[PDB]
Amino acid sequence: VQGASLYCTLAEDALDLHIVVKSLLCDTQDAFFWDPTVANRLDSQYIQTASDLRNYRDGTEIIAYASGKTGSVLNIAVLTRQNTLHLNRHNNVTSIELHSPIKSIKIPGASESIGRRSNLVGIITENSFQIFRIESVHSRSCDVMVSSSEPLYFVEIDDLQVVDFQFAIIDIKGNWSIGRIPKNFNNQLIDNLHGTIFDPEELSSWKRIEWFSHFQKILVFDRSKMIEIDFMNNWQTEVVQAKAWSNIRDYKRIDDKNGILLTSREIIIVGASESNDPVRRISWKHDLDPDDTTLRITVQKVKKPDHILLVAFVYSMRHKRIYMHVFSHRKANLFQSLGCSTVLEIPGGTPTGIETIFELVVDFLVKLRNSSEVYYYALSNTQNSIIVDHPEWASLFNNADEREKESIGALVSQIKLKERERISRVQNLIEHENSHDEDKYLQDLGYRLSIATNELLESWQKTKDESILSGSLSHSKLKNLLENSDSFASIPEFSSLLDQFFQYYQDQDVTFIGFEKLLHLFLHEDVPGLDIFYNKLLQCWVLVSPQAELLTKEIVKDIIWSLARLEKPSLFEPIQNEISRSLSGPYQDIISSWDMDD
Amino acid sequence: MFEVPITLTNRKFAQRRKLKYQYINYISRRFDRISKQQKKRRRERHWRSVSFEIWRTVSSQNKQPINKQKMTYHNFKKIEKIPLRKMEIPLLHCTKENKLYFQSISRGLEPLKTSTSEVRNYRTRHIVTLTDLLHLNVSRHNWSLAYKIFATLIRIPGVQIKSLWGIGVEILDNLSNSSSGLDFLQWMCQIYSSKSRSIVPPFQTGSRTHTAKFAITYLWSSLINCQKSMLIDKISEWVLTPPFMEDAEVWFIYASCHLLKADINQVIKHIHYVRTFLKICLDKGGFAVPSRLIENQLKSFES
Amino acid sequence: KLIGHEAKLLFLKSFQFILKRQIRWLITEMRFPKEFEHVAKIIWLKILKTINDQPQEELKLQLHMTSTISILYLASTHLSLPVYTCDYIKWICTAKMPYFQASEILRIQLPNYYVSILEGSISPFNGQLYNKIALTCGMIHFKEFFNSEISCQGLLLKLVMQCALPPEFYFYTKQVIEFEETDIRNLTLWERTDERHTGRVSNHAELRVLSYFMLTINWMLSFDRDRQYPLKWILSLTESLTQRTTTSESIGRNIVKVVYPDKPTSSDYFQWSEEETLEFLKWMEKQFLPTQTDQKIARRKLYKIFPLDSTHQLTFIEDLQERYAKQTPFFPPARKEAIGRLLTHIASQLLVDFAISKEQLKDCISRIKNACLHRMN
Ligand SMILES: [Mg+2]
């Protein structure tokens, strides 16, 4: 719109989105809050040693990631990229043990202007700040021998937020220092230019130093504001917004020197100079929508003939979703935006590190909350071409000892042969359907049960005047004759038995419960007949099991029995204890007891 | 996982705001000493500044030089030691979850539960899922579904309209039926440009000083509804109508209407016209390309 | 204006009134029996008599909504109806059975102390329901006064059909059930306190039923030395279970997924199909008319600017039939994987459906699994 009709309304392009390509790379209060001083515990970037500067070889790609029970060891090892990025063939990770937990690791890289690339990688612990030289990796076996540019435990008993980079720059909560690293061996790192951005009314601990233009001028951040500091003169500026409606959420230098990517809350900010002197950009921006404190960002930078476009990954610690926007650098210092897109990932947890390195391919690594794995991902535009270890449930399914294997197998055999007994047993009962034998059985069954039911009704007459409760004892049953249930095997004549039993005990003060309206809960549609119940279940299972007729009959029998009513003497007996308990209660709770409201 | 268009559940977040700004008061007070209530939160949040047409910012020059270390461990804990007990008093009145909250923000930790993520009431959690599905579908080009989401959402009694860009790009890419994004935008401007705090950032605003988003977007988008043409003297008729003189961007909208109408002495008057509104658009925070894209077009016109 | 210090009467009146309101909706719209009402007057009568045998003007009563549902389930279980807690959770989370509003918007102005005593403790979703029904089961005693045996076998059926298991697993799980218990299932887990730390994660009958169910599937399937259940059909079972389709049930479980405390289930609303989202907005304009709480007509025309707006979706036994057919092709160590993903999906469904925790469930099936290993070894 802006340029299309400044020149003289849809977009510039059609509608294209996200796809994946996955791979494994390497393996290694608090419930409601998090420490901002722990940014990222793994980096991977192009490094270049001295022996790489004798030739024209462009160094190598390395990863450095933290490890340990207490996360207090550094691991540095080389990568080789072929079909997809992968760890070196000889897998000789070079790990060095510290005694302090690692809070932040970053390998600095260098500008294109210097010709060289970084020779070092630096770390902030809970106790110290150290810089490591990588000196002379060699292909004899893919070794990465490193040296320990010496720690400085503390000068101020202060934790340090961010390190930026030859210039070791530190930020501790409010106050910063520019410093330098020793050359190779064995004098350690010193400083002489210092400052502070302290702000009593910002409680969150994270601040951040990353400089700008390579002009030898720095940026210092807290969740309240963004301060530029031209630090080889004397210069300081609070750039134009402050702390009114949003917090600075992250900032990372979009890799090209004069380029700045800042997550606020609900805004992706592309700062970057369009003047040799440092800048702000209010070249308009996009916005992204939460209250989440835990948002971070990274950019990948892809090159093309007519533009130079940047992909912005904003990720969280709450949900494994990644939120992506795309910008473009047509170097008239032209910036435009196109439309949003978001992807998910997998079960419980969330990103602790996202790190980047007519279609778009953008590739990176992720590390998830509380999972030592490091996964390489790749993303493409179109399509022209769970492995469960939930240790909570496997610990519940795989139980250890061998007698706890053959124990389970023993029980399984017990029930399996029992099931054979069920099949062979009921079979002949199915052979007799509509027989005169099953008729005899439904007769002497129905009214045998009628005799027992009457007996239990007499022994309900003797205890009738209880009036303390209103639920008769062990009521609803076949009433202590159990063999009489099973032996039949014809659902409709059995439903007719029950209908004529309910009919028979219509002599009042007896329970009434209509089954159909309750099978409603079983099949989730009106089940008028006790038979149609059997029909529907039999369709379903006749698709799936042999003797589905026998089981379905045995289970509609089992259900119809499990629900076979015979509760306390009916409605006229409950009102007795109803009123009599509504008596022993004090008089005005008795006045509050209220039927038929409105 | 998206912003909700409802006022936030009230009880606990407000008393946390209390504890926060009250402790902030005590620490910053004693800090200025060493350098020598909703209303407490109110004063506290108070004393503080509250080649293409880039509404440029204010860059770096005329700003004061430096500061060198103010805060060692001992000195900070000097400033911190006392205001924390003062906090020990009303911490005893607030709830335990907000005790632990205050202790953690005052340790410097940050909460990883959002205000949304802990509202946990039926209706609001449902609205959260609804709004989410709106934002998702709008990302997914599913303008049909997204439209159903939007209508069902605005139906609900709690949602006031941040969602206007949602519907702007929504009906824009919809093309389907309903009175389109221009209709909606000029509606937003007609209803919310007259008198006729908590909830209000800048993408919905009051007509004292700049009502931003919707106005400039119906302005430009209407000039693009002239890109449909080659209506203009209409758009600059009702850009001529309002006095809101600081509105420089509407001065560049004005001069753009005159350049688009300039594409005989009438065309002359239109070219002198745009020549004028460009400088009365140098009145305010500049939208500039140069003088040559401004004029060189007008000399290709002077042909 | 509003009562002071003896609005115990008004409190118990809005409470009792809300109860009979819910009963009206379940005999009416759920085709319950009329006897349920009298059983409810008896149980609510017993605990009403017990709180009005308590003295203090300090109320000390907690008539939360969990007590309403608690006496509904208590009475239903006495009457041996095949309704289970998950029926209730579904019924209330889908706004069908009125629940979430103390006298929903339309009533009475009570002391804000009691309005809070109602709106508070509203959720059932961490087993609050099981704990509140055992608590009521102490408050007035289950044993002599009522018959607190659960309707076990219909829950087995409910469960096999809820998966797509062949009807053998009804008798399987029924048999492991008889094996550890011999079928005796209680309702109290009460020793009035908050304190508990062993023996009493697993003594709500249902949760043990689910535990036996899961266990059964794992054992049974991982020891079919017959090879009765193919290495594949466990996969096809998992997939027919996984295919998000639009029946009243699955749509419901989505609606419950929305108000379940823990992720993932909300990531599950993230992954809804277009038809799921559509039937969702349908349920929104239908059952969020049960909402709560010049320019007004300007917003009737304003909202009337954009439209407020042969049965396609199939029934329950239709879907059930069709996945039973989707596996109808019925007639080596990485099959344990199939076992495990099936078990974890089934688990997921049970966690949302029976409003408990991941950790709760696995605690119970862990305990009762060692409770079968112990009576097996
Ligand atoms: Mg400021």
Short mmCIF file of C-alpha atoms in Angstrom, two decimals, chain B residues 29-278:
data_model
loop_
_atom_site.label_atom_id
_atom_site.label_comp_id
_atom_site.label_asym_id
_atom_site.label_seq_id
_atom_site.Cartn_x
_atom_site.Cartn_y
_atom_site.Cartn_z
CA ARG B 29 12.53 7.39 47.86
CA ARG B 30 15.49 6.18 49.89
CA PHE B 31 17.56 6.23 46.69
CA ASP B 32 16.93 9.97 46.21
CA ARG B 33 17.59 10.38 49.93
CA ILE B 34 21.04 8.87 49.40
CA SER B 35 21.63 11.02 46.31
CA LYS B 36 20.83 14.08 48.45
CA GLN B 37 -3.65 2.79 47.73
CA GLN B 38 -4.77 3.08 44.13
CA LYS B 39 -3.60 6.70 44.48
CA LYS B 40 -0.11 5.64 45.59
CA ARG B 41 0.08 3.52 42.46
CA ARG B 42 -1.35 6.53 40.60
CA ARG B 43 1.26 9.11 41.58
CA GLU B 44 3.91 6.39 41.26
CA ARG B 45 3.03 5.48 37.67
CA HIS B 46 2.38 9.20 37.21
CA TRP B 47 5.52 11.29 37.49
CA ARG B 48 6.96 10.03 34.16
CA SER B 49 6.45 10.86 30.46
CA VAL B 50 3.20 8.98 30.02
CA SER B 51 12.51 7.28 0.49
CA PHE B 52 9.16 6.44 2.10
CA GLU B 53 6.80 8.19 4.48
CA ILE B 54 8.41 7.25 7.80
CA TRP B 55 6.95 9.23 10.71
CA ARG B 56 10.55 9.48 11.96
CA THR B 57 11.48 9.32 15.66
CA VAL B 58 13.84 11.56 17.69
CA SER B 59 17.41 10.38 17.14
CA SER B 60 20.49 10.80 19.37
CA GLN B 61 21.86 14.30 19.83
CA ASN B 62 21.60 16.76 22.73
CA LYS B 63 21.65 14.11 25.45
CA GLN B 64 23.73 14.14 28.65
CA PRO B 65 27.08 12.34 28.77
CA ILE B 66 27.46 9.59 31.31
CA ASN B 67 27.26 8.04 34.75
CA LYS B 68 29.92 5.96 36.49
CA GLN B 69 28.98 3.10 38.87
CA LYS B 70 26.35 3.96 41.43
CA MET B 71 25.59 0.57 42.93
CA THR B 72 27.88 -1.89 44.66
CA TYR B 73 26.57 -4.85 46.64
CA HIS B 74 26.99 -3.16 50.02
CA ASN B 75 25.52 0.15 48.83
CA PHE B 76 22.52 -1.48 47.15
CA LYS B 77 21.66 -3.67 50.15
CA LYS B 78 21.98 -0.42 52.11
CA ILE B 79 19.18 1.03 49.98
CA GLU B 80 17.21 -2.24 50.07
CA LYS B 81 17.45 -3.26 53.73
CA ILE B 82 14.81 -0.95 55.22
CA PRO B 83 12.02 -0.65 52.57
CA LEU B 84 11.70 -4.44 52.60
CA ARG B 85 10.48 -4.53 56.22
CA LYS B 86 8.09 -1.64 55.68
CA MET B 87 6.84 -4.07 53.06
CA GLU B 88 6.82 -6.69 55.80
CA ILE B 89 3.84 -4.82 57.28
CA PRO B 90 1.23 -4.90 54.45
CA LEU B 91 2.57 -8.20 53.16
CA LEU B 92 0.87 -9.52 56.26
CA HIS B 93 -2.49 -8.25 54.95
CA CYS B 94 -2.26 -9.66 51.43
CA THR B 95 -2.67 -13.26 50.34
CA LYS B 96 0.03 -15.93 50.48
CA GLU B 97 0.30 -16.30 46.70
CA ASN B 98 0.94 -12.55 46.58
CA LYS B 99 3.45 -12.80 49.43
CA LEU B 100 5.42 -15.24 47.26
CA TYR B 101 4.77 -13.03 44.24
CA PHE B 102 6.21 -9.96 45.94
CA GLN B 103 9.14 -11.90 47.36
CA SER B 104 9.96 -13.13 43.86
CA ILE B 105 9.64 -9.88 41.92
CA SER B 106 11.65 -8.26 44.73
CA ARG B 107 14.29 -10.95 44.38
CA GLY B 108 14.22 -9.97 40.71
CA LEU B 109 12.61 -13.13 39.33
CA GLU B 110 9.86 -12.79 36.71
CA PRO B 111 6.57 -14.71 36.79
CA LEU B 112 6.06 -17.37 34.14
CA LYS B 113 2.29 -17.33 34.67
CA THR B 114 0.42 -14.57 32.81
CA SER B 115 -2.62 -12.70 34.09
CA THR B 116 -4.59 -14.57 31.45
CA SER B 117 -2.95 -17.90 32.34
CA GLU B 118 -4.29 -17.59 35.90
CA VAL B 119 -7.75 -16.07 35.40
CA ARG B 120 -9.25 -19.57 35.43
CA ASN B 121 -12.94 -18.72 35.23
CA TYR B 122 -15.27 -20.57 32.84
CA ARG B 123 -16.48 -17.68 30.66
CA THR B 124 -13.09 -15.98 30.44
CA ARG B 125 -11.21 -19.18 29.58
CA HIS B 126 -13.79 -19.78 26.87
CA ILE B 127 -13.33 -16.27 25.49
CA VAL B 128 -9.57 -16.95 25.57
CA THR B 129 -10.04 -20.02 23.39
CA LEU B 130 -12.43 -18.12 21.10
CA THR B 131 -10.11 -15.14 20.57
CA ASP B 132 -7.17 -17.52 20.10
CA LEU B 133 -8.99 -19.39 17.34
CA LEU B 134 -9.69 -16.01 15.77
CA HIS B 135 -6.01 -15.06 15.70
CA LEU B 136 -5.03 -18.54 14.53
CA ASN B 137 -7.52 -18.72 11.67
CA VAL B 138 -6.61 -15.17 10.60
CA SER B 139 -3.02 -16.38 10.43
CA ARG B 140 -4.18 -19.46 8.48
CA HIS B 141 -5.93 -17.46 5.72
CA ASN B 142 -9.14 -19.22 6.85
CA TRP B 143 -11.07 -15.97 6.41
CA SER B 144 -14.41 -17.82 6.48
CA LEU B 145 -13.92 -19.54 9.83
CA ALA B 146 -12.07 -16.51 11.19
CA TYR B 147 -15.12 -14.45 10.23
CA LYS B 148 -17.42 -16.76 12.18
CA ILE B 149 -15.02 -16.48 15.14
CA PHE B 150 -15.06 -12.69 14.92
CA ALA B 151 -18.86 -12.36 14.80
CA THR B 152 -19.41 -14.80 17.67
CA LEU B 153 -16.74 -12.93 19.64
CA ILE B 154 -18.02 -9.36 19.20
CA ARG B 155 -21.43 -10.79 20.18
CA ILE B 156 -20.11 -11.42 23.70
CA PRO B 157 -20.81 -8.66 26.26
CA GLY B 158 -17.26 -8.34 27.53
CA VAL B 159 -15.22 -7.59 24.42
CA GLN B 160 -14.60 -4.04 23.38
CA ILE B 161 -13.08 -3.50 19.99
CA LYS B 162 -9.37 -3.82 19.68
CA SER B 163 -10.22 -6.47 17.07
CA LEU B 164 -10.75 -3.82 14.37
CA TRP B 165 -7.54 -4.68 12.46
CA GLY B 166 -8.67 -8.29 12.71
CA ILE B 167 -11.80 -7.30 10.84
CA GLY B 168 -10.03 -4.78 8.57
CA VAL B 169 -7.69 -7.33 7.04
CA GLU B 170 -10.54 -9.81 7.58
CA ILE B 171 -13.23 -8.29 5.36
CA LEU B 172 -10.39 -7.02 3.15
CA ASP B 173 -9.28 -10.54 2.24
CA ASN B 174 -12.90 -11.70 2.48
CA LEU B 175 -14.34 -9.88 -0.56
CA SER B 176 -17.39 -12.01 0.18
CA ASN B 177 -20.43 -10.06 1.32
CA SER B 178 -20.51 -7.66 4.20
CA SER B 179 -20.01 -3.87 3.87
CA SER B 180 -16.30 -3.93 3.38
CA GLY B 181 -13.23 -2.78 5.29
CA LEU B 182 -13.65 0.78 4.10
CA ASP B 183 -17.20 0.79 5.50
CA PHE B 184 -15.90 -0.56 8.80
CA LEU B 185 -13.03 1.93 8.98
CA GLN B 186 -15.07 5.06 8.26
CA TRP B 187 -17.54 3.63 10.78
CA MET B 188 -14.78 3.45 13.41
CA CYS B 189 -13.91 7.06 12.65
CA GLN B 190 -17.52 8.26 12.69
CA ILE B 191 -18.41 6.58 16.00
CA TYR B 192 -15.11 7.15 17.83
CA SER B 193 -14.10 10.71 16.90
CA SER B 194 -16.25 12.48 19.49
CA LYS B 195 -16.82 12.48 23.25
CA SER B 196 -20.19 10.89 22.49
CA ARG B 197 -6.92 5.18 32.42
CA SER B 198 -6.93 1.37 32.22
CA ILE B 199 -8.06 -0.02 28.88
CA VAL B 200 -6.55 2.53 26.50
CA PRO B 201 -3.20 2.18 24.70
CA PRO B 202 -2.82 3.93 21.27
CA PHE B 203 -4.66 1.66 18.80
CA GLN B 204 -7.98 2.90 20.22
CA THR B 205 -7.91 6.52 21.21
CA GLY B 206 -9.86 9.68 22.07
CA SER B 207 -10.28 12.71 19.83
CA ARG B 208 -8.42 15.25 21.97
CA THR B 209 -5.02 14.52 20.45
CA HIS B 210 -4.34 12.01 17.76
CA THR B 211 -6.77 9.22 17.21
CA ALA B 212 -4.24 7.27 15.19
CA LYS B 213 -4.71 3.83 13.63
CA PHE B 214 -8.21 3.72 12.17
CA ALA B 215 -8.15 7.31 10.87
CA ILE B 216 -4.90 7.15 8.92
CA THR B 217 -5.82 3.69 7.65
CA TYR B 218 -9.18 4.72 6.18
CA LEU B 219 -7.35 7.77 4.76
CA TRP B 220 -4.64 5.87 2.91
CA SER B 221 -6.91 2.93 2.10
CA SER B 222 -9.42 5.35 0.57
CA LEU B 223 -6.72 6.92 -1.59
CA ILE B 224 -6.12 3.32 -2.70
CA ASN B 225 -9.85 3.08 -3.40
CA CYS B 226 -8.82 5.77 -5.89
CA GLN B 227 -6.03 3.48 -7.06
CA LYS B 228 -9.21 1.65 -8.07
CA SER B 229 -9.90 4.71 -10.23
CA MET B 230 -6.68 5.52 -12.08
CA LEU B 231 -13.88 10.09 -5.54
CA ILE B 232 -10.71 12.18 -5.02
CA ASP B 233 -12.31 15.59 -4.45
CA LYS B 234 -14.56 13.63 -2.07
CA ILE B 235 -11.68 12.17 -0.04
CA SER B 236 -9.90 15.54 0.06
CA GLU B 237 -13.28 17.20 0.56
CA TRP B 238 -13.60 15.42 3.92
CA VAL B 239 -9.87 15.76 4.46
CA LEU B 240 -10.56 19.46 3.82
CA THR B 241 -13.45 19.33 6.30
CA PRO B 242 -11.77 18.53 9.64
CA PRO B 243 -9.61 20.96 11.53
CA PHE B 244 -7.00 18.93 13.45
CA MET B 245 -4.05 20.94 12.27
CA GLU B 246 -1.26 18.91 13.89
CA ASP B 247 -2.34 15.89 11.78
CA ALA B 248 0.68 16.16 9.45
CA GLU B 249 0.13 12.67 8.08
CA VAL B 250 -3.27 13.90 6.92
CA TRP B 251 -1.41 16.77 5.30
CA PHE B 252 0.55 14.22 3.27
CA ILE B 253 -2.76 12.45 2.61
CA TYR B 254 -4.11 15.81 1.42
CA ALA B 255 -1.14 16.56 -0.85
CA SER B 256 -1.35 12.97 -2.08
CA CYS B 257 -4.99 13.54 -3.05
CA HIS B 258 -3.82 16.60 -4.99
CA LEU B 259 -1.00 14.71 -6.71
CA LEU B 260 -3.40 11.91 -7.65
CA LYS B 261 -5.88 14.46 -9.00
CA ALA B 262 -3.00 16.11 -10.89
CA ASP B 263 -2.33 12.63 -12.34
CA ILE B 264 -5.82 22.66 -17.75
CA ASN B 265 -5.19 25.63 -15.48
CA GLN B 266 -7.35 23.62 -13.07
CA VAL B 267 -4.64 20.93 -13.00
CA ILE B 268 -2.29 23.88 -12.44
CA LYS B 269 -4.24 24.89 -9.33
CA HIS B 270 -4.03 21.28 -8.11
CA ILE B 271 -0.25 21.25 -8.56
CA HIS B 272 0.19 24.54 -6.71
CA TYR B 273 -2.16 23.02 -4.11
CA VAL B 274 0.02 19.97 -3.43
CA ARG B 275 3.04 22.30 -3.47
CA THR B 276 1.40 24.13 -0.54
CA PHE B 277 0.25 21.20 1.58
CA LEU B 278 3.74 19.68 1.41
#
